[PDB]
């Protein structure tokens, strides 16, 4: 009933998040070559999550998934500051896409358990998220590995269905 598209750069933690949501084993995850799908129950809703590979090479394929998307979840590796510019560019381009107009976006600031992890507030400032005015959005700090913060993000999602 709710179509969630799971996007973000390669190595951001999207599939780790996908398994965390499905309440499944988190400790062994292969890089995604194409895509994964899982259905999860949350707060009376059935969420169909489309988890897409995020390598630069395969980002053109992202558009093939846009149609009928209800919610965008965009995952950022908070501890990969080197690629903050790259993820900002991809997010900016995504939000310009006609097929994703008005679609609520949850930004997960992932890998908060790590040492060099930038706080959500710093990521929101650096990526100028406040200028997003064509849709509702939220940034949520999380660790897909431990699961902490994940539910908090998903509560926002279910609120904005």
């Amino acid at each position: 009933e709710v179509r969630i598209l799971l996007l973000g750069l390669d190595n951001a933690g999207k599939t780790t998040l996908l398994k965390q949501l499905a309440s499944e084993d988190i400790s062994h995850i292969t890089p995604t070559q194409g895509f994964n799908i899982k259905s999860v129950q949350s707060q009376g809703f059935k969420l169909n999550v489309w988890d897409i590979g995020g390598q630069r090479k395969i980002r053109p394929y992202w558009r093939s998934y846009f149609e009928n998307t209800d919610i965008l979840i965009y995952v950022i590796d908070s501890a990969d500051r080197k690629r903050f510019e790259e993820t900002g560019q991809e997010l900016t381009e995504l939000l310009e896409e006609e097929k994703l107009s008005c679609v609520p976006v949850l930004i997960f600031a992932n890998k908060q358990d790590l040492l060099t992890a930038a706080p959500a507030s710093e990521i929101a400032e650096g990526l100028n998220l406040h200028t997003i005015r064509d849709r509702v959005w939220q940034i949520q700090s999380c660790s897909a590995l431990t699961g902490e913060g994940v539910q908090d993000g998903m509560n926002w999602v279910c609120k904005n269905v």
Binding site: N36, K57, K82, L115
Partner: protein, 314 residues
């Protein structure tokens, strides 16, 4: 606050002793002509814009990611291995999942081959099994028709010639062996071409002496001229045991909840008979599955990987 990074170093030999990283993230960037030895476990490692470096990375719980690197020689263990925009890398790898490259060329792979006293516990702390190693089955996101952007290092390649052990006073406390028979990760052939189409599956069941049993069996089989193709460590449910072992399953059911099983795949003419003969002498009193014949062995191996790939997969 980030003596957890090596940055902008030139013509240096540097490292981290056991205990000094302790599962924290580590970063390497803009290093040229450097020898880097992290003899501890870490959460994740990124290597950016490095040139002519020798790098040892202790067990990495998450991903290792090489970006914009050239002419680097590396030994590392990780959950995921990723490469982008790199050229002429040579890695001795232990990877829990399928290594990937992207927009890269001349990337060569060998099996992880390294020992030091602290290393085994570092693997444990990083949550990495020494038996879950797919180092040779690379996926290239950007292949080029009629050519290959990656290959396997020569089997006779000498580890010391690529990643020499440190000789500095600061790094001397770590007593390293690059000998194949001391390697914490058993040397597996993976996807290398074989002579022989004879396989043999061994399944050992969880317990205090199982790791030692596996190493002894490998040593004995290699000592007789046979090859270790691949290993696995995975939990077996009753249905999985019935699938793989068939009529021999009832003997093994009481042992499945002990913990994950350890599977060995051997290769070579005579492998099944020889493996049976070794097991018959040195493991009497210890239950373990060994393929009954070469005619059923390939089926055993395929059924094992069948269920194992499903359970470990997404």
């Amino acid at each position: 606050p980030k003596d957890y990074m090596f940055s902008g170093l030139k013509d240096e030999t540097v490292g981290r002793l056991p205990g000094t990283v302790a599962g924290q993230q580590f970063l390497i960037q803009d290093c040229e002509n450097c020898n880097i030895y992290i003899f501890d476990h870490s959460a994740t490692v990124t290597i950016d814009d490095c040139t002519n470096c020798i790098i040892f990375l202790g067990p990495v719980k998450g991903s290792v990611f090489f970006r914009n690197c050239r002419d680097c020689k590396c030994t590392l263990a990780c959950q995921q291995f990723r490469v982008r925009d790199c050229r002429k890398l040579e890695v001795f790898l232990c990877c829990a999942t399928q290594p990937i490259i992207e927009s890269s060329s001349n990337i060569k792979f060998g099996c992880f081959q390294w020992y030091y006293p602290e290393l085994a516990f570092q693997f444990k702390d990083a949550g990495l099994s020494i038996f879950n190693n797919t180092w040779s089955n690379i996926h290239d996101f950007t292949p080029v028709s009629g050519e290959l952007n990656w290959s396997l290092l020569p089997e006779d390649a000498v580890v010391q010639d690529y990643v020499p052990i440190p000789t500095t006073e600061e790094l001397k406390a770590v007593r390293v062996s690059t000998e194949a028979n001391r390697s914490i990760v058993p040397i597996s052939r993976g996807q290398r071409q074989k002579s022989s189409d004879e396989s043999c599956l061994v399944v050992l069941f969880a317990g205090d002496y199982t790791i030692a049993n596996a190493r002894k069996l490998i040593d004995e089989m290699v000592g007789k001229g046979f090859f270790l193709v691949q290993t696995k460590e995975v939990s077996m449910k009753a249905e999985d045991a019935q699938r793989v072992f068939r009529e021999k399953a009832p003997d093994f059911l009481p042992l499945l909840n002990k913990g994950p099983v350890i599977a060995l795949e051997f290769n070579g003419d005579g492998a099944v008979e020889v493996c049976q003969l070794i097991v018959n002498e040195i493991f009497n009193g210890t239950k373990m599955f060994v393929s009954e014949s070469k005619e059923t062995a390939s089926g055993d191996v395929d059924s094992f990987y069948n269920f194992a790939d499903i359970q470990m997969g997404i």
